[PDB]
């Protein structure tokens, strides 16, 4: 029931298309880019995942140590104290680790299809205790007061949400961890409502709850409260295991239109649509029963972690939504959707 016009050039960016940004590492994954416009170009703020060349029978990966220095961790695949069933997150002696380190990297484009690094625009790397395992999946809020980045901060003590601000994409201010663990999928709204700031977010409950889309509000972007549960998973549907907002919602006359991701217990991620009241964004007006984009293309089906569509950045020009997205947690893609057709599906 897929209604997305894929870019014929997909994929736009694969790991081999770029030079590694961490010393002695290679690029495993390009995914989940933020999206904005600046100095006449379309930009992606890529999630770039890197690790050492893998040796037979050894999982090895970078973290930052206490002095901020890359350090390589190694575990034997047959070590009985190792749980490596999932390629993204492992356990060893009761503690969790990632198989890669991620950072944020700017690429630019004149055509919105061929992308390249930009001299003077170096990448954004984890800093501090709370970003020791990297930063990920950055949403970019294009606003009157500039650009606001909301991304996953990962470390041995938390998956949480950080926020940064920039005017020129060279200088940044860090607002710290705005949402504690375990939380991600933080889609900041690009405008105020009732002179208040709003964001979607996505706390995960070990028990007594799940992985649902929530709402919070803020006077100042640094401090958040009045949390509300917007939309849960749906038992026995494609979005039965988790849901999360992608990019900021689009202002329409029907309401706030959010292209959200959902996944089942096999970790197959699809896109869906959510519509929310203009003045109370916690009120669900409508929700696509079926996905509006499933992982159908071949580059969407096999990779580092397969059967995954994921967008946390987009552009809107009239009726035409241009989403950029990660495919199989490996490569960058572009596709187009129609507001009118989405709203039509919701009635
Ligand atoms: O955030 C930690 C970890 O959580 C999930 O497993 C995925 O989103 C990974 O890509 C990510 O690195």
Nearest CA to ligand 1 atom 11: 88
Provide φ and ψ at 154, rounded to 5°. Answer: -115, 145
Measured at the CA of 339, the angle between CA 228 and CA 277, to 5 degrees, comes to: 25
Residue among 95, 132, 152, 326 to mutate when testing ligand 1 (max atoms within 8 A of CB): 152
Q: How far apart are CA 326 and CA 37, in angstroms?
A: 19
Cα–Cα distance, 322 to 111 (Å, whole number) = 13
Centroid of ligand 1 to alpha carbon of 150 (angstroms) = 15
Strands 320-327 and 101-109: unpaired
Q: Please tell me the residue having the least CA distance from ligand 1 atom 9.
A: 88
DSSP 164: E
Would you say how long the chain is, in residues?
Answer: 347
Query: Using CA atoms, how far apart are residues 110 and 73, in angstroms rounded to an integer?
Result: 40
Rounded CA separation 44/108 (Å): 7
Ligand 1 pocket, mutate which of 85, 86, 88 (most atoms under 8 A from CB): 88
Tokens of 252: 């329409």
Cα(90)–Cα(149) distance, rounded to whole angstroms?
27
The three-state DSSP-derived secondary structure of 108-151 is EECCCCCCECCCCCCCECCCCHHHCCEEEEEEEEEECCEEEEEE
Tokens of 9: 């050039």
Reading the block at residue 240, the tokens are 């039965």
What are the backbone angles phi and psi of residue 252, rounded to the nearest 5°?
-125, 175
Name the residue with tokens 């009761």.
94
Measured CA to CA, the distance from residue 209 to residue 233 in angstroms comes to: 10
Contact 178, 224 (CB under 8 A): yes
Phi, psi of 130 (to 5 degrees): -85, 0
Measured from CB, residues less than 6 Å from any atom of ligand 1 are 88-89, 98, 136, 152, 154, 159
Q: What is the Cα–Cα distance from 166 to 98, expressed in whole angstroms?
A: 28
With contact defined as beta carbons under 8 Å apart, do 269 and 308 qualify?
yes
Domain ranges of the chain: 5-345
Residues in Cβ contact with 318 at an 8 Å cutoff, skipping those fewer than 6 apart: none
- What CATH topology corresponds to 5-345? Tachylectin-2; Chain A (2.115.10)
Look at residues 106, 115, 114 and name the one whose alpha carbon lies nearest to residue 170: 106
**Method for this entry:** X-ray
Contact 345, 275 (CB under 8 A): no
Residue nearest to atom 5 of ligand 1 (CA): 88
């Amino acid at each position: 029931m897929d209604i997305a016009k894929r870019c014929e050039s997909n994929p736009l960016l694969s790991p081999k298309d770029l030079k590694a940004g961490i010393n002695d590492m290679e690029i495993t994954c390009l995914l989940n880019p933020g999206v904005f416009k600046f100095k006449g170009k379309t930009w992606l703020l890529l999630r770039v995942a890197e690790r050492p060349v893998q040796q037979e029978g050894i999982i090895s990966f970078p973290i930052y140590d206490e002095q901020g220095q890359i350090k390589v961790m190694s575990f034997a695949e047959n070590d009985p104290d190792l749980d490596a069933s999932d390629p993204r997150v492992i356990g060893y002696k009761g503690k969790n680790y990632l198989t890669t380190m991620s950072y944020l990297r700017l690429v630019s484009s004149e055509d919105g299809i061929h992308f390249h690094d930009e001299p003077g625009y170096p990448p954004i790397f984890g800093k501090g205790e709370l970003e020791a395992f990297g930063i990920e999946d950055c949403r970019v809020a294009s606003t009157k007061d500039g650009f606001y980045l909301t991304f996953t901060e990962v470390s041995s003590v938390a998956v949480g949400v950080g926020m940064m601000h920039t005017n020129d994409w060279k200088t940044f201010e860090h607002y710290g961890m705005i949402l504690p663990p375990h939380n991600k999928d933080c889609a900041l709204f690009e405008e105020k409502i009732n002179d208040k700031y709003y964001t979607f977010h996505r706390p995960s409950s070990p028990e007594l709850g799940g992985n649902y889309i929530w709402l919070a509000e803020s006077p100042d972007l640094r401090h958040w409260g009045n949390h509300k549960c917007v939309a849960t998973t749906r038992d026995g549907f494609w979005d039965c295991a988790r849901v999360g907002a992608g990019a900021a919602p689009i202002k329409t006359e029907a309401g706030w239109l959010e292209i959200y991701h959902g996944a089942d217990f096999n970790h197959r991620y699809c896109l869906g649509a959510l519509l929310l009241d203009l003045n109370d964004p916690s009120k669900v007006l409508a929700r696509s029963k079926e996905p509006i984009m499933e992982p159908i293309a071949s580059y969407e089906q096999t990779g580092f972690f397969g059967n995954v569509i994921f967008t946390n950045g987009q552009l809107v020009d009239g009726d035409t939504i241009t989403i950029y997205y990660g495919a199989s947690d490996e490569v960058i893609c572009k596709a187009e959707l129609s507001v009118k057709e989405i709203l039509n599906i919701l009635n």
